[PDB]
Design a protein around this motif. Structure first.
Motif, PDB file in Angstrom:
ATOM      1  N   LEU A 165      -3.650   5.196  -1.414  1.00  0.00           N
ATOM      2  CA  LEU A 165      -4.058   5.803  -0.863  1.00  0.00           C
ATOM      3  C   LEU A 165      -2.936   7.394  -1.488  1.00  0.00           C
ATOM      4  O   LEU A 165      -2.699   8.166  -0.364  1.00  0.00           O
ATOM      5  CB  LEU A 165      -4.446   5.672   0.281  1.00  0.00           C
ATOM      6  CG  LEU A 165      -5.364   4.159  -0.073  1.00  0.00           C
ATOM      7  CD1 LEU A 165      -5.232   4.228   2.274  1.00  0.00           C
ATOM      8  CD2 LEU A 165      -6.243   4.701   0.135  1.00  0.00           C
ATOM      9  N   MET A 217      -9.600  13.491   2.555  1.00  0.00           N
ATOM     10  CA  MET A 217      -8.717  13.212   3.992  1.00  0.00           C
ATOM     11  C   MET A 217      -9.796  12.671   5.048  1.00  0.00           C
ATOM     12  O   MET A 217      -9.723  11.420   5.611  1.00  0.00           O
ATOM     13  CB  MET A 217      -8.074  14.332   5.068  1.00  0.00           C
ATOM     14  CG  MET A 217      -7.216  13.487   5.571  1.00  0.00           C
ATOM     15  SD  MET A 217      -6.189  12.696   5.659  1.00  0.00           S
ATOM     16  CE  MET A 217      -5.023  12.031   7.011  1.00  0.00           C
ATOM     17  N   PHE A 237       0.604  -1.221  -0.483  1.00  0.00           N
ATOM     18  CA  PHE A 237      -0.178   0.264  -0.321  1.00  0.00           C
ATOM     19  C   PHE A 237       0.683   1.160   0.080  1.00  0.00           C
ATOM     20  O   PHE A 237       1.629   1.274   0.561  1.00  0.00           O
ATOM     21  CB  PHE A 237      -0.651  -0.056   1.427  1.00  0.00           C
ATOM     22  CG  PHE A 237      -1.098  -1.101   1.739  1.00  0.00           C
ATOM     23  CD1 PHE A 237      -0.753  -2.208   2.380  1.00  0.00           C
ATOM     24  CD2 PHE A 237      -3.182  -1.581   1.043  1.00  0.00           C
ATOM     25  CE1 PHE A 237      -0.904  -3.044   2.650  1.00  0.00           C
ATOM     26  CE2 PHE A 237      -3.524  -3.048   1.514  1.00  0.00           C
ATOM     27  CZ  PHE A 237      -2.894  -3.679   2.052  1.00  0.00           C
ATOM     28  N   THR A 238       1.040   2.037  -0.652  1.00  0.00           N
ATOM     29  CA  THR A 238       1.187   3.052  -0.801  1.00  0.00           C
ATOM     30  C   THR A 238      -0.136   4.609  -0.538  1.00  0.00           C
ATOM     31  O   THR A 238      -0.064   5.455  -1.645  1.00  0.00           O
ATOM     32  CB  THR A 238       1.971   3.855  -2.263  1.00  0.00           C
ATOM     33  OG1 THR A 238       1.214   3.496  -3.831  1.00  0.00           O
ATOM     34  CG2 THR A 238       2.944   2.408  -2.527  1.00  0.00           C
ATOM     35  N   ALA A 239       0.592   4.905   0.641  1.00  0.00           N
ATOM     36  CA  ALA A 239      -0.694   6.150   0.881  1.00  0.00           C
ATOM     37  C   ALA A 239       0.456   7.635   1.259  1.00  0.00           C
ATOM     38  O   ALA A 239       1.447   7.723   0.599  1.00  0.00           O
ATOM     39  CB  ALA A 239      -1.294   6.166   2.641  1.00  0.00           C
ATOM     40  N   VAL A 283     -10.958   8.366   3.649  1.00  0.00           N
ATOM     41  CA  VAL A 283      -9.903   7.425   3.602  1.00  0.00           C
ATOM     42  C   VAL A 283      -9.467   7.870   4.625  1.00  0.00           C
ATOM     43  O   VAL A 283      -9.131   5.983   5.516  1.00  0.00           O
ATOM     44  CB  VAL A 283      -8.159   8.558   2.731  1.00  0.00           C
ATOM     45  CG1 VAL A 283      -7.368   7.400   2.975  1.00  0.00           C
ATOM     46  CG2 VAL A 283      -8.423   8.058   1.958  1.00  0.00           C
ATOM     47  N   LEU A 284      -9.071   8.563   5.870  1.00  0.00           N
ATOM     48  CA  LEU A 284      -9.079   7.937   7.372  1.00  0.00           C
ATOM     49  C   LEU A 284      -9.897   7.224   7.908  1.00  0.00           C
ATOM     50  O   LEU A 284     -10.123   6.303   9.026  1.00  0.00           O
ATOM     51  CB  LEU A 284      -8.540   9.469   8.083  1.00  0.00           C
ATOM     52  CG  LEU A 284      -7.626   9.792   8.168  1.00  0.00           C
ATOM     53  CD1 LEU A 284      -7.466  10.981   8.856  1.00  0.00           C
ATOM     54  CD2 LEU A 284      -6.662   8.785   9.180  1.00  0.00           C
ATOM     55  N   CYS A 310      -3.216  -3.132   7.925  1.00  0.00           N
ATOM     56  CA  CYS A 310      -2.845  -3.299   6.510  1.00  0.00           C
ATOM     57  C   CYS A 310      -1.583  -3.597   6.878  1.00  0.00           C
ATOM     58  O   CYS A 310      -1.088  -4.517   5.562  1.00  0.00           O
ATOM     59  CB  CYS A 310      -3.339  -1.976   5.997  1.00  0.00           C
ATOM     60  SG  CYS A 310      -4.449  -1.916   5.977  1.00  0.00           S
ATOM     61  N   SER A 369      -5.788  -0.558  11.782  1.00  0.00           N
ATOM     62  CA  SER A 369      -6.632  -1.322  11.680  1.00  0.00           C
ATOM     63  C   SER A 369      -5.876  -2.536  10.912  1.00  0.00           C
ATOM     64  O   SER A 369      -6.660  -3.218  10.962  1.00  0.00           O
ATOM     65  CB  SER A 369      -6.643  -0.742   9.275  1.00  0.00           C
ATOM     66  OG  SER A 369      -8.208  -1.731   9.161  1.00  0.00           O
ATOM     67  N   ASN A 411      -8.269  -6.233   0.923  1.00  0.00           N
ATOM     68  CA  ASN A 411      -7.096  -6.288   0.500  1.00  0.00           C
ATOM     69  C   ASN A 411      -6.691  -7.505   0.410  1.00  0.00           C
ATOM     70  O   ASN A 411      -6.016  -8.210  -1.448  1.00  0.00           O
ATOM     71  CB  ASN A 411      -5.711  -6.160   2.337  1.00  0.00           C
ATOM     72  CG  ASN A 411      -4.662  -6.886   1.434  1.00  0.00           C
ATOM     73  OD1 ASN A 411      -3.516  -6.798   1.127  1.00  0.00           O
ATOM     74  ND2 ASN A 411      -4.495  -7.362   3.270  1.00  0.00           N
ATOM     75  N   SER A 462      -3.426   5.503   9.692  1.00  0.00           N
ATOM     76  CA  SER A 462      -4.333   4.107  10.355  1.00  0.00           C
ATOM     77  C   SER A 462      -5.093   3.245   9.288  1.00  0.00           C
ATOM     78  O   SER A 462      -5.457   1.949   9.719  1.00  0.00           O
ATOM     79  CB  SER A 462      -5.613   5.127   9.803  1.00  0.00           C
ATOM     80  OG  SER A 462      -7.464   4.869  10.203  1.00  0.00           O
ATOM     81  N   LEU A 463      -4.104   2.736   8.862  1.00  0.00           N
ATOM     82  CA  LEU A 463      -3.658   1.470   7.711  1.00  0.00           C
ATOM     83  C   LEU A 463      -2.986   1.225   8.613  1.00  0.00           C
ATOM     84  O   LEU A 463      -3.715  -0.187   8.443  1.00  0.00           O
ATOM     85  CB  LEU A 463      -3.387   2.120   6.742  1.00  0.00           C
ATOM     86  CG  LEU A 463      -4.312   2.148   5.205  1.00  0.00           C
ATOM     87  CD1 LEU A 463      -4.583   3.863   4.759  1.00  0.00           C
ATOM     88  CD2 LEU A 463      -3.679   1.606   3.717  1.00  0.00           C
ATOM     89  N   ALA A 494      -9.719   3.202   5.357  1.00  0.00           N
ATOM     90  CA  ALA A 494      -8.497   2.855   6.037  1.00  0.00           C
ATOM     91  C   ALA A 494      -8.976   1.686   6.553  1.00  0.00           C
ATOM     92  O   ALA A 494      -8.394   0.336   6.226  1.00  0.00           O
ATOM     93  CB  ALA A 494      -8.688   4.023   6.823  1.00  0.00           C
ATOM     94  N   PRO A 495     -10.555   1.640   7.603  1.00  0.00           N
ATOM     95  CA  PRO A 495     -10.495   0.560   7.991  1.00  0.00           C
ATOM     96  C   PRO A 495     -11.379  -1.247   7.039  1.00  0.00           C
ATOM     97  O   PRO A 495     -11.932  -1.352   7.571  1.00  0.00           O
ATOM     98  CB  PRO A 495     -11.782   0.792   9.185  1.00  0.00           C
ATOM     99  CG  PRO A 495     -12.544   1.728   8.678  1.00  0.00           C
ATOM    100  CD  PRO A 495     -11.257   2.683   7.356  1.00  0.00           C
ATOM    101  N   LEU A 496     -11.181   0.139   6.092  1.00  0.00           N
ATOM    102  CA  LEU A 496     -11.950  -1.540   5.192  1.00  0.00           C
ATOM    103  C   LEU A 496     -10.696  -1.767   3.753  1.00  0.00           C
ATOM    104  O   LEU A 496     -10.959  -2.904   3.178  1.00  0.00           O
ATOM    105  CB  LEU A 496     -13.468  -0.915   4.030  1.00  0.00           C
ATOM    106  CG  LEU A 496     -14.503  -0.217   4.836  1.00  0.00           C
ATOM    107  CD1 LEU A 496     -14.408  -0.831   6.316  1.00  0.00           C
ATOM    108  CD2 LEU A 496     -15.814   0.491   3.731  1.00  0.00           C
ATOM    109  N   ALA A 497      -9.401  -1.145   3.872  1.00  0.00           N
ATOM    110  CA  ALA A 497      -8.617  -1.901   3.642  1.00  0.00           C
ATOM    111  C   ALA A 497      -8.591  -3.022   3.861  1.00  0.00           C
ATOM    112  O   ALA A 497      -7.539  -3.873   2.862  1.00  0.00           O
ATOM    113  CB  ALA A 497      -7.249  -1.081   3.554  1.00  0.00           C
ATOM    114  N   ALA A 498      -8.615  -3.455   5.284  1.00  0.00           N
ATOM    115  CA  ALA A 498      -7.952  -4.786   5.544  1.00  0.00           C
ATOM    116  C   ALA A 498      -8.947  -6.224   4.873  1.00  0.00           C
ATOM    117  O   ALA A 498      -8.152  -6.487   4.420  1.00  0.00           O
ATOM    118  CB  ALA A 498      -8.868  -4.212   6.967  1.00  0.00           C
TER     119      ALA A 498
END
Lengths: 294, 294, 293, 293
Positions: free
Chosen positions: B126, B101, A218-220, B104-105, A234, A232, B116, A228-229, B109-113
């Motif tokens: 991101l 912002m 991932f590249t934030a 994404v936060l 990630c 979570s 992925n 936050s990633l 963020a809590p859905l990237a999990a």
């Protein structure tokens, strides 16, 4: 108290303004005078501050430890002057501080309640851009950045030193396991920056002793998104300390390769234009800012 | 069965894309041709969806309930379209999202999990920006933006709807009062946006029935910053519900003026190129986002 | 770029026997049906069907998109029906013959919510065994784990459901929890009275064969078994919706989770096509498809 | 634009009593000391002097510069000792004579950390009432609530403190919580034996003057008044450091939080100028200022 301001200022000048020669010219003084007072200072202090054995005079472990305090004395002196200046001279007008998104959220936001009670007449204007483009255009007054690419005759002000970290969520650790070494970071999930490998080189050292580069999944773009990633779960991200310190204190992010991670800090500093320094509204904020974050 | 997806897709557009006129504009069709359809759609269901009694057409009690169904049909129709496009093809490659912002936060963020695991070959990027310039230049692939100024042929895929909520801290309200009327706001600290008169026009109906216009003391250039100003007692602020609904549930933030605050919902959507819709990678991300935030 | 006009045509051709027959039901030519079917699997990016055979077959991609396509078209009708029942209020007695455990664990809960939405339908929840009542028109709509609906009458998919072998915590405490499928032969296992039909559970053994049991206690219903099981009479194996609730409350424990089959079994409302014009029947089904699945 | 010499003048002038009295401890002319404070005020542009009072009083605005100027000098002296510390490992006996409360509440708990930090300093904690033995050099340093140290014995500022009126929950239950300063008259109040001095509590009556308790119990030490309060003998007024943690534990309850004065009083270490050559002493002061400041 056998030291004075005149040699605490002089000494602090040498360090920041290059070396011996560049400080003398800076502070409207002879080189002969710059050596006399500094050699006296280290004479009366009982310790050797800087070495002449370096190409450009570098501070000793002792002399560097002094400099950080030497700075604060001159800072909170200068600051306490401003404090009194603003007592008759009313401090007012709009002020804008372009800061990196993490710095605003964790540093500026909470202490912005206290700044309001002291100076309720200052219309603060926190903003968030990318480069030093905005700072210089007077639509932004002061830039809070951890960047040492400030050399265009602009003024910088040391806010705080702060070293990097490497951390992961408990979720990620419990499922994907922990990396014992930095070489095991090849077989894990990474978190890097969108920019071309600039911050993607971490402050952890590999078997060679080199700063460990990474292959990010991932590249934030922002430092907070990464956080936050990594919160979570990630993967593992590397950030500055202040951005993630509380969560380690909480328990939300567990540090790893704590022995491998280098401890060299990087200064965060509020940059600004030299002619904006005469404005009390800027002064009162910087004098307010460096003190609250030691 | 008598209703055809053609007219269902016409109906879902006209609702969330303003009024009768602005819908046909975005769908390459005349208003004489578009209203022909939707009038037939009513007169085969035997019920009245539209309501042009007031200036702008609004949904009847029944007209909204057909919309909710109408939208999902068209959503999970597109999803099964996608589900098959990813049979003889597979989602792999760099995916560059440019979101505000706040989003994404909180949302991503809590859905990237989740995102992925399901698509581990997708390299998510991101990013974040202010304008739509990057996306036009195709350096970012998809932008999540609560903005309805995208009448540019480039697609604007709806994601979710959000009410505003005027909020403060329990430390602030219990140490500067809780305003009952919408006229008592003038004497409280009101944090707004840095943009002159843009969203500083709050969506809270004054004593005359109009949107409250706020003289902002603090002016933050981000919604997420205004949150962490308010969260640490700097003044009451007006932002989207998803940004802070979680905080007020935890009890760290207080809702203000429940009755005097407006109920109409601001639509957020993921806008992108029409030609880049053929990307299976981009297709499965918008599919994921709809069916995770609804 | 998809549309109903083609999604309907594919959802017909599969269920309506062969390609040639699908055109007969939709009132369109076979030149039309090939054009639009070929156009759909062009814009999907997959080959759905296989026409090398004398009778068209379902490639797993075509069969999966079908069971999606179906629901989309189901919903699209439910949406329409939901409006038509605005100003043509559904009312009267709608009787629903149902398997004792479906009524208790699915309907009963939802009934009040349905009551609310359509207060003028006086439900009549009943129970029977066969399809004798429904085929004789003494009932309107039968709720079954029912594939045996080959008699012209319609069937509507409600939900697929997994099996789950379980036992009460107090039994497991007093008799030990089996670590293996073959270990079951030691424990007390409860089954149905109906000789052997349902007493081959969905819990595979070392062979990979679903485990048969020799039961000592035999109830004539999933519900009775569930009740015996809760009281710690033995281990049963029932469908997930009978016991998932009690797993939450912690009154039953999953046994042999990894050995338990992941295959699911379908549930349906079955009813007559001529009874499909019943505006209340229709609305009750749309309600159940909504709540379950 | 300021410098260190003028801070160190101003900070002496204020804390060393008079204007002419400072110069004779600072080894300067009364002419020169006045030139410097006139200079300091000139470049700052704010009054620190208030010559309208018999004795020089601190301008409410200039009073802030003092406590800013005071730390700068404190820090500025810590930097030095810190550098000196790296050469010599400070050792031997360090005799600290404090009040029973400061020792039991400020030193005692911070002793551990100091012990670890400079293990070769053997602290000797004593408690005498006068500055007799400090002057005789039988003790190295005395911590006092000392505003009367004016015998050419340089004093360093440890910390500023507020008073607090507080009482036992047990007492408050049996005698009630007073809402006004006048209500104290009925409650029982515990004060010092020493004629009327600290019997003028830092809580204002309706008029604006402080209150003068007429105590039935009289303890000689603020620590005894602490233990008497805790046992619920009555209401007492002591300094914040002596009772904050009991308030923190809910074992003592704060009274009249509003009528109580927000004005602070200073605690100072008191040692000879010639004994600032010690590293054992210097580092202990630098420690105390740091931990509690």
């Amino acid at each position: 108290m056998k030291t004075n301001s005149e040699e605490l200022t002089v000494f602090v000048q040498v360090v920041e303004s290059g070396s011996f020669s560049r400080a003398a010219e800076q502070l409207a003084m002879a080189n002969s005078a710059v050596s006399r007072i500094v050699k006296r200072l280290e004479e009366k202090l009982g310790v050797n501050l800087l070495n002449r054995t370096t190409r450009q005079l570098s501070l000793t472990e002792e002399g560097a430890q002094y400099f950080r305090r030497a700075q604060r004395i001159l800072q909170e002196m200068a600051a306490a002057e401003t404090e009194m200046l603003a007592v008759h001279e009313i401090p007012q007008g709009v002020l804008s501080v372009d800061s990196a998104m993490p710095m605003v959220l964790h540093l500026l936001a909470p202490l912005a309640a206290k700044f309001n009670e002291r100076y309720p007449h200052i219309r603060l204007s926190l903003v968030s851009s990318e480069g030093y483009i905005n700072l210089i255009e007077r639509k932004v007054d002061i830039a809070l950045r951890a960047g040492e690419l400030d050399d265009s005759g602009l003024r910088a002000r040391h806010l705080f030193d702060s070293r990097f970290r490497v951390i992961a969520s408990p979720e990620y650790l419990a499922k994907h396991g922990t990396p014992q070494s930095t070489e095991e970071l090849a077989g894990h999930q990474c978190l890097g920056f969108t920019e071309p490998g600039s911050l993607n080189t971490w402050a952890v050292l590999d078997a060679q002793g080199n700063p460990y580069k990474i292959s990010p999944h991932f590249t934030a773009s922002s430092g907070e998104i990464l956080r936050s990633l990594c919160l979570s779960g990630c993967g593992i991200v590397c950030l500055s300390d202040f951005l993630v310190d509380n969560d380690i204190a909480e328990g939300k992010l567990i540090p790893l390769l704590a022995e491998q991670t280098s401890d060299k800090t990087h200064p965060f500093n509020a940059v600004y234009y030299s002619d904006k320094a005469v404005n009390l509204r800027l002064r009162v904020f910087l004098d307010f800012l460096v003190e609250e974050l030691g």
